[PDB]
Design a protein around this ligand. Structure first.
Ligand SMILES: Nc1ncnc2c1ncn2[C@@H]1O[C@H](CSCCNC(=O)NCc2ccccc2)[C@@H](O)[C@H]1O
Ligand SMILES: Nc1ncnc2c1ncn2[C@@H]1O[C@H](CSCCNC(=O)NCc2ccccc2)[C@@H](O)[C@H]1O
Ligand code: NA
Ligand code: NA
Lengths: 333, 333
């Protein structure tokens, strides 16, 4: 049912336009494909979830002999219009349907896609990307090739305090003759369980990031159902740790060069922004302390993830945790 | 599946808070119940879709002997907390579940609810409100008692022109080596099929409104599957008619007085705003002409309506039409 809502959403030209207006996303994919044009020239390509078809056009710009553009939403009909209007019906073949269900007439040299969501994994499309390797020749490549999830402890009492302010409605002991205040705790708890999608000043980061790498050439679809990221941070700053900040990079590892698409808060902003998950209660750390714990991502039936975080300051034993739902993010930007 | 998404959405305190922050909505419901307190005192009440429970508290404020508060979402657990904290467990009974499936131990004197969506009918909750009359005594009442949908022709070339501007991305004949322009027509057509939720200056209205009344005491659940609203407008202004504007009123017809909740653009703004549906092409009308046609609402499987509009200027024969999806509104406010 969540899957019906997902494909309906991506069938709108307005949504495809929104994503295509991210100039870092467009420019980095085009650079990755075209700087590596020798990897595409005279090759067979699969574009998984082609949307508008623009990655298939970039593969054609690089001289690919045949591109299969697979799309499950009504967007497949719009991609076919662009293939005809750009005079590329000899080299781009649009296949309507799910990459899990369609028939390709041949194996491919390289798979291209944009399957990344918030915190890399949101919307679970990387599972369809990995599934598509059933069509990849043993010698074949995938663009993107690897994904790096970064997480770092942050300090931000303004974000922490806002969770209480947003619930101010429920604090009212006398609203049209009703005491609402018994729900203040539940309302604040609900806000704390929303991952925060926005950007921030890099100075809120209190330690160098921990990196978790997924190699898309090696990973199996089932690997992404449960993602466990242990961490030990070497604290560089003293203050309250309010939670963990997340971002991701992908690398396109070509024969000619490796091209990175970074969503780090040190890099130009993208439509992925960054994601912050609060602890239920902040932890005091001094520079030189270690903050250890685990971030566990469990895939759910709403095409998203439940996020379990636990952290302790090793030197004091101070600990906190949270359980968040990436289906219900707070868009704070 | 749409129904799962619907009940998940209303289970969040953040959504209930959003609705409860509409001071016209809160104040008008409280006034309707309490000015008519003699209708509630010592009576049995059913609150359909109680959310936070606040209408059940208003019924208790009016001296109701017993209130059954029915709620299908996880909000039922929060309403029960408020009933306990307000010391009303003797008079308010929270029943978790769908009003279509639960067991009430007795018939009720009056049904109260807030079942109204955009354009009155959006989200299809009025069908559950009417269903609940299986529990109403023959002598019983419903608050609200009637609903009036208003529609009027409007002139607004800024809104019409925006539909083209919003698609400017697809006009590009050279975007990273791709001609996008063959999709400009499809993108503009998609924007025209989105009902526009916003408010506007009353001077864009070119005729007195046509009123379509639903009497909730008489209406059957099945009546709302297909709603056909013929119209003939007596044009008061000369210019291009770009579409139809919609709003609604509900009346609470008590023994002591009738209280109105109006979402008209002459009245203080509410969270319902107003809704505008463009024609595919504008119609020139002069003052004294008549604009005739039909607005047809067909309920769909996404808890919303397909909106078919047809209109002609009687004096010229100029005609236009559109088919819109109220599931995909443009929030322009
Ligand atoms: N199992 C599946 N089988 C088939 N289609 C599936 C499956 N899972 C998801 N989908 C579709 O995947 C799309 C993700 S959104 C468009 C991304 N591609 C895009 O913008 N390409 C152009 C571009 C330009 C520049 C830079 C990057 C990308 C949607 O249309 C889904 O309907
Ligand atoms: N078949 C159904 N059975 C049971 N519950 C159902 C069904 N269909 C929908 N629902 C629920 O109905 C609510 C609509 S939103 C809350 C409206 N009530 C509210 O604010 N009351 C307080 C208030 C205060 C002031 C002014 C007006 C109202 C949701 O919680 C749904 O989950
Ligand atoms: Na807590
Ligand atoms: Na048209």
């Amino acid at each position: 049912s969540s899957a019906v809502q997902y494909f309906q959403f991506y069938g709108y030209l307005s949504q495809q336009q929104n994503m295509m207006q991210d100039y870092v996303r467009t420019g980095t994919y085009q650079r990755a494909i075209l700087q590596n044009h020798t990897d595409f020239k005279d090759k067979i390509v699969l574009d998984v979830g082609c949307g508008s078809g623009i990655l298939s056009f970039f593969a054609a710009q690089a001289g690919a002999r045949k591109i299969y553009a697979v799309e499950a939403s009504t967007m497949a009909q719009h991609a076919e219009v662009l293939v005809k209007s750009n005079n590329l019906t000899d080299r781009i073949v649009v296949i309507p349907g799910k990459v899990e269900e369609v028939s390709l007439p041949e194996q491919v040299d390289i798979i291209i896609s944009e399957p990344m969501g918030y915190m890399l994994f949101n919307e679970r499309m990387l599972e369809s990307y990995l599934h598509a390797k059933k069509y990849l020749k043993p010698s074949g490549n995938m663009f993107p090739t690897i994904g790096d999830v970064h997480l770092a402890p942050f300090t931000d009492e303004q974000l922490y305090m806002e969770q209480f302010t947003k619930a101010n409605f429920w604090y009212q002991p006398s609203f049209h003759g009703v005491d609402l205040s018994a729900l203040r705790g539940a309302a604040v708890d609900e806000y704390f369980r929303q991952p925060v999608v926005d950007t921030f000043d890099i100075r809120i980061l209190m330690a160098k990031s921990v990196k978790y790498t997924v190699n898309f050439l090696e990973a199996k679809e089932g690997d992404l159902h449960r993602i466990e990221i242990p961490f030990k941070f070497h604290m560089l700053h003293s203050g309250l740790v309010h939670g963990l900040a997340f971002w991701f990079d992908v690398a396109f590892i070509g024969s000619i060069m490796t091209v990175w698409l970074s969503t780090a808060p040190t890099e130009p902003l993208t439509h992925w922004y960054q994601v912050r998950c609060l602890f239920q209660s902040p932890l005091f750390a001094k520079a030189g302390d270690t903050l250890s714990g685990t971030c566990l991502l469990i895939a759910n039936k709403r095409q998203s993830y439940d996020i379990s975080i636990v952290a302790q300051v090793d030197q004091t034993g101070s600990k906190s945790s949270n359980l968040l739902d990436l289906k219900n993010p707070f868009f704070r930007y």
